[PDB]
Amino acid sequence: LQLNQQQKELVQILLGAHTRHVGPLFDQFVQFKPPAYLFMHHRPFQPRGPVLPLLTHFADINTFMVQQIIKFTKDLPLFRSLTMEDQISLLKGAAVEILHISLNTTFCLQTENFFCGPLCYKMEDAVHAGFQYEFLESILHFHKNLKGLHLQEPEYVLMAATALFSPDRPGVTQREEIDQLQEEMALILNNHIMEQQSRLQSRFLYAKLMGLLADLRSINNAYSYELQRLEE
Amino acid sequence: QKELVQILLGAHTRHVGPLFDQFVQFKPPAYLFMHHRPFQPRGPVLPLLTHFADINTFMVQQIIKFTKDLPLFRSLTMEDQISLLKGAAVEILHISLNTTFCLQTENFFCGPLCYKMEDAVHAGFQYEFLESILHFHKNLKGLHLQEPEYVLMAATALFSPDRPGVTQREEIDQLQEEMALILNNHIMEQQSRLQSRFLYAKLMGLLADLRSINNAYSYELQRLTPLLGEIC
Numbered sequence A: 001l002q003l004n005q006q007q008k009e010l011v012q013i014l015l016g017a018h019t020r021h022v023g024p025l026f027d028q029f030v031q032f033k034p035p036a037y038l039f040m041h042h043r044p045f046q047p048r049g050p051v052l053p054l055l056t057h058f059a060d061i062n063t064f065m066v067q068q069i070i071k072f073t074k075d076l077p078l079f080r081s082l083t084m085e086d087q088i089s090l091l092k093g094a095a096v097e098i099l100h101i102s103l104n105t106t107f108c109l110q111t112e113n114f115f116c117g118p119l120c121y122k123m124e125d126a127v128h129a130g131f132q133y134e135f136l137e138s139i140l141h142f143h144k145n146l147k148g149l150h151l152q153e154p155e156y157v158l159m160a161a162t163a164l165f166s167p168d169r170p171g172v173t174q175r176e177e178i179d180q181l182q183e184e185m186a187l188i189l190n191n192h193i194m195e196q197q198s199r200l201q202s203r204f205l206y207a208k209l210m211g212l213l214a215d216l217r218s219i220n221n222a223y224s225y226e227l228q229r230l231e232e
Numbered sequence B: 001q002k003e004l005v006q007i008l009l010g011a012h013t014r015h016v017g018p019l020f021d022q023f024v025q026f027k028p029p030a031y032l033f034m035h036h037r038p039f040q041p042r043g044p045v046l047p048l049l050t051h052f053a054d055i056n057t058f059m060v061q062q063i064i065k066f067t068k069d070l071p072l073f074r075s076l077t078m079e080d081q082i083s084l085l086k087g088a089a090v091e092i093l094h095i096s097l098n099t100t101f102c103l104q105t106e107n108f109f110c111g112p113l114c115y116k117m118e119d120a121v122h123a124g125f126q127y128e129f130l131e132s133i134l135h136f137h138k139n140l141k142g143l144h145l146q147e148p149e150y151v152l153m154a155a156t157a158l159f160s161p162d163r164p165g166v167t168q169r170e171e172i173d174q175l176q177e178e179m180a181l182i183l184n185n186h187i188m189e190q191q192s193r194l195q196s197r198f199l200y201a202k203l204m205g206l207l208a209d210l211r212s213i214n215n216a217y218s219y220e221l222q223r224l225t226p227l228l229g230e231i232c
């Protein structure tokens, strides 16, 4: 219950990593041939026509986010300290979770749209790309729930690090060493939140976050085929 | 009593709800239709000053139509109605305007329109003033309020007995408290979702920061070339 020098230094390293590779991420989507209507924020009756371009765009931004995210982790000495296998296994399992956690950063609660650069994503756009409604609703509830907590870079990065060092993921060997990492990550998350008692005013913030981390994992386990198909 | 909050709710929804979806009706410069755009202060100003003037008028009219459906209000000396409105109108406008504010992008989404501070800046308004306005809207928005706490907050400001020109600052400093604590109570009747520490105090702390800017800055809210037929 209080952050020591080691911990404060860790937060900074995380933030640094996040800021270089993920923060600038969302503003690069426009480079991946986005369909014209994506540039409009207000389009109640606008048609979308062909799926291919829209579809391959989502394909584009998804690969780019997963790439940057990999870089993100790669900039963490703690992560590098693990075995090749374990890393590939942790990323292979936490990339989607870090993605929506990072993406919530551009999410607007008032309009339930993500503002990435000059682009404006709406749930209906994913619908038009063939994503399952139930999937999309869950993904949406998550983002609404998480935005309502009024988080900031620090809380976002810590949370992401918490999801990264999860041992329960298949293919891991150093299960107990890594589980130690996650616990140190959560304790820093928790204590960090307290340090900001005045800013963060939702009750049971920590639990609510870890709770949402649970919801996220469930959603992927359930509609995993939606993503596996996108990746091909 | 809690039925007075049904009177307020129906008043607001009828004349102030669709208030914002009509701004598109008053010759808004094409750029207000875009959410992502360059700041060009060397651009034409007059057409934008004209717009803000037309919608400032329009808004005032609906806020009048609003208060004109509050029995507790009409049942007062016309010399006070005018007086109270002479200073509340503005304050309400911003409380009601806040429902179109997105905390993420800091824009105001009114119908197909997207208003930015940059716009008030170009219109020629002064920093500090705008700064207060933005600060007000960021703070208030961060409290996750819904209609009930809006119409409510608004009405307690509607009856502010310490306003210049009021006749019976006796029956007014009564009608207000006859709702100030009715606001504090409702806040608890929903203590679950409204979990901001010390809402009320923070709320009234906002009603006070609105008045202070309603004053210090007023000479400019006036300027708003009040000529329509002036163009053919």
Ligand SMILES: C[C@]12CC[C@@H](O)C[C@@H]1CC[C@@H]1[C@@H]2CC[C@]2(C)C=CC[C@@H]12
Pocket (backbone or CB within 6 Å): A058, A059, A061, A062, A099, A114, A121, A122, A123, A124, A125, A126, A131, A136, A139, A140
């Ligand atoms: C398509 C994408 C982005 C690429 C891929 O991660 C899958 C997700 C599913 C969920 C999508 C999101 C883009 C932005 C969307 C459209 C907004 C709500 C649902 C969102």
Ligand SMILES: C[C@]12CC[C@@H](O)C[C@@H]1CC[C@@H]1[C@@H]2CC[C@]2(C)C=CC[C@@H]12
Pocket (backbone or CB within 6 Å): B052, B055, B056, B090, B093, B108, B115, B116, B117, B119, B120, B133, B221
């Ligand atoms: C112009 C107006 C509306 C009329 C008048 O109350 C002054 C204010 C100042 C502040 C303005 C607002 C319109 C909408 C704006 C442009 C959005 C942010 C700043 C906002």
